[PDB]
Design a protein around this ligand. Structure first.
Ligand SMILES: Cc1cc2nc3c(=O)[nH]c(=O)nc-3n(C[C@H](O)[C@H](O)[C@H](O)COP(=O)(O)OP(=O)(O)OC[C@H]3O[C@@H](n4cnc5c(N)ncnc54)[C@H](O)[C@@H]3O)c2cc1C
Ligand SMILES: Cc1cc2nc3c(=O)[nH]c(=O)nc-3n(C[C@H](O)[C@H](O)[C@H](O)COP(=O)(O)OP(=O)(O)OC[C@H]3O[C@@H](n4cnc5c(N)ncnc54)[C@H](O)[C@@H]3O)c2cc1C
Ligand SMILES: Nc1ccc(C(=O)O)cc1
Ligand SMILES: Nc1ccc(C(=O)O)cc1
Lengths: 391, 391
């Protein structure tokens, strides 16, 4: 077969890039290793920046989001006896964030693609990239037991952290920066009403807790746990008792608990690779960088990479300005690093770290007291949270 | 002898407290271990907050400062190829800082005290504090070979990091928080014109450098050095070559070098003790807390402790409200911790740390890029730098 842009991975990055390209007349083929419902089983993200919201509207897939997504104007941080609200809308100059599940976003894009007629090959096994530096790169995969070859101009690696794309660039060409945190997030999805109309991030002596939601009758909760814990040790009862123990007395008593629909432990990590391209291969989303969940940047960074990649490919295809594609990494890395910094800061001020001396505990508490009590401090949290502008 | 308030230490904290008290009619006696010129030989501080400036005016010793001190409206930070100015005056809401040497401040207070006739015992050896919890505490010291006893109501320990005051409080009553940095500052004082009309803080791959001044024909420079260096290894030539190597090409070429009047290495440290009092003993300045030089808070924090102590003693003496003195530590610790946080942040973003991984280097660079490029970020640096309000 033959196409213009081959896309590896049908997660939100790939589907979003694919929809944008298709709408603009640039033919693309998506290759996914798993099945549609496997992809649709991943819970993940819940908070989206306004830029991603506008990107979905531009990809023409915002009907359901516009109807079901919730617009939040503030977030709360609870620490050592108090609860503080950050009015994002006034502190950021009128910007907000939208709560709409990643499963939903993926679902909406899958429907949109399924309808357009654009090619998508699920269960594409053994994907391999070839001739990344020639004028005609190609991808080979196995459908059942037949290995097919797909010819293209460019390849977008949107295959997540464990994808084949990043592995296909000569190790010597990339420079990796990584930080692994000594803890993970145990999340729990329940069909219960959320405890607040806005999220609650809480720093507690027992560790971090987060009160989120998916809708008015569906909540998503998290608690910081050691990397040595296995989800089978955490019953529903245990989770609720623990969550309650870490929240303000008045919040815990309003909490409506219930059986879990999903429970899992996600480990925290920071990861950036430089550069994000190689020949005719460009990496996007989790294939190029990972941020700890704390700042809600992962999917949002994937969206800005995709936005940049899409717009540079548009110029190359319709305007014949293929030289602009060399600028991909420079543009993306600027936003990536700023987002990585915010995610790291949030992670360090809200979590309980092992083997922390009295001094560093005091500095962690004061960081919160200063940023949450200063007009200039609240503003730095706010603009970063709502999302820094796309360049 | 007998007095109302006995003051241990004739550094700026003690002399300032002493002058304020004297002016208000509260008799005080200062006890200094060294000689007047020993105290006057310490170079130290150069930057003063507006609050300290107003405290000096209130102590009635601001003539020379008002004439010789320099008012700075901005500071510069140079990092990885660039130089950025922080306009403190507009970003802080009209506030500024004054450059007037600590030697000068001390000199002016010594003259003021010498003139008023208030008691000061230099070369008071073997100072010991007694009955800190009774109604009548007393201090004993040796003048020559005679041990005298001084009776008082309260004792202000303004004796610096190595004073006898802090050591006199039962170890079990105090909680210490300390952080020692793996480097020191090698400073050099020269009778040369400063390289800029405003300070330049520089982060360089070889380490930190700082371009300060004392007047238009006197400069003070610093460079970060390992704790293993001895000043005898650092000749004048070597210092200048090193300083030059760490500054922007355009700044280094304007530099007017010259022989040093003073050269010394100060090690960096963070130190706070809780509480700051015990019975009739109250600690102030370096006796209670130490901050790394980077944020220029040391002397400024000593000034706010003294301001609080003075005003609570006024109420106790003239208004008979001695119960208010129990609030000393609570009031002071609030400002202390905020200042400690700022000093720690400045120290970590401007210095080169040993055994730093690629990720943390990248985060350090991005912290600068974000705070120096954001209106909200610049403001957090500015208000903290000019000084947070006295409570
Ligand atoms: C607990 C948690 C909470 C989070 N919270 C938020 C939030 O509130 N907001 C936010 O912005 N971010 C959040 N994130 C992150 C977000 O989930 C990810 O950044 C986002 O999924 C990345 O999308 P992606 O398309 O790059 O990759 P993925 O979702 O990983 O999809 C990549 C696709 O690649 C396919 N693939 C893999 N290998 C191959 C191969 N060899 N060939 C073919 N296909 C292959 C995979 O099967 C997968 O379908 C959170 C993440 C977690 C884990
Ligand atoms: C390199 C450097 C740069 C700095 N830069 C700045 C700046 O720009 N701005 C700023 O705010 N801060 C700065 N600081 C800090 C500032 O110098 C100190 O915080 C300030 O000196 C503390 O004043 P103090 O009165 O509490 O103590 P000190 O200056 O230490 O004086 C204490 C007095 O106690 C006396 N004493 C000690 N033991 C006894 C005893 N047993 N009995 C009697 N007397 C005794 C001592 O001899 C001394 O005279 C800097 C410090 C250094 C070292
Ligand atoms: N920071 C985060 C905020 C919200 C969620 C979520 O709703 O899943 C996850 C992370
Ligand atoms: N942060 C600092 C600023 C200035 C000086 C000084 O002038 O000595 C010292 C420290």
């Amino acid at each position: 077969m033959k196409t213009q842009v081959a896309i590896i991975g049908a997660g939100p990055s790939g589907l979003l890039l694919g929809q944008l390209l298709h709408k603009a007349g640039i033919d693309n083929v998506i290759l996914e290793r798993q099945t549609p419902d496997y992809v649709l089983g991943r819970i993940r993200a819940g908070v989206l920046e306004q830029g991603m919201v506008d990107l979905l509207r531009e990809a023409g897939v915002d009907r359901r989001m516009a109807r079901d997504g919730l617009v939040h104007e503030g977030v709360e941080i609870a620490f050592a006896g108090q609860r503080r609200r950050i009015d994002l809308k006034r502190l950021s100059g009128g910007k907000t964030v939208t709560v709409y599940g990643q499963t939903e976003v993926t679902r909406d894009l899958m429907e949109a693609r399924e309808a357009s007629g654009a090619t998508t090959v699920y269960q594409a096994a053994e994907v391999r990239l070839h001739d990344l530096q020639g004028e005609r790169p190609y991808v080979t995969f196995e459908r059942d037991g037949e290995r097919l070859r797909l010819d293209c101009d460019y390849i977008a690696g949107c295959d997540g952290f464990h994808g084949i794309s990043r592995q296909s660039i000569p190790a010597e060409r990339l420079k990796v920066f990584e930080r692994v945190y000594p803890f993970g997030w145990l999340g729990l999805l329940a069909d219960t009403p959320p405890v607040s109309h806005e999220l609650i991030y809480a720093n507690h002596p027992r560790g971090f807790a987060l009160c989120s939601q998916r809708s008015a009758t569906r909540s998503r909760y998290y608690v910081q746990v050691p990397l040595t814990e296995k989800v089978e040790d955490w019953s529903d009862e245990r989770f609720w008792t623990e969550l309650k123990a870490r929240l303000p007395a008045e919040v815990a008593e309003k909490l409506v608990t219930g059986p879990s629909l999903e429970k899992s432990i996600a480990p925290l990590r920071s990861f950036v690779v430089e550069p994000m391209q190689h020949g005719r291969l460009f990496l996007a989303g989790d294939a190029a960088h990972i941020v700890p969940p704390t700042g809600a940047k992962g999917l949002n960074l994937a969206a800005s990479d995709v936005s940049t990649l899409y717009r540079l490919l548009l110029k190359a295809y319709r305007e014949g300005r293929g030289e602009l594609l060399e600028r991909y990494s420079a543009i993306c890395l600027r936003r990536i690093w700023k987002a990585e910094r915010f995610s790291w800061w949030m992670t360090s001020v809200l979590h309980r770290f092992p083997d922390t001396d009295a001094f560093s505990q005091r500095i962690q508490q004061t960081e919160l007291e200063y940023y949450l009590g200063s007009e200039a401090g609240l503003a730095t949290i706010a603009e970063n949270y709502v999302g820094l502008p796309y360049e």
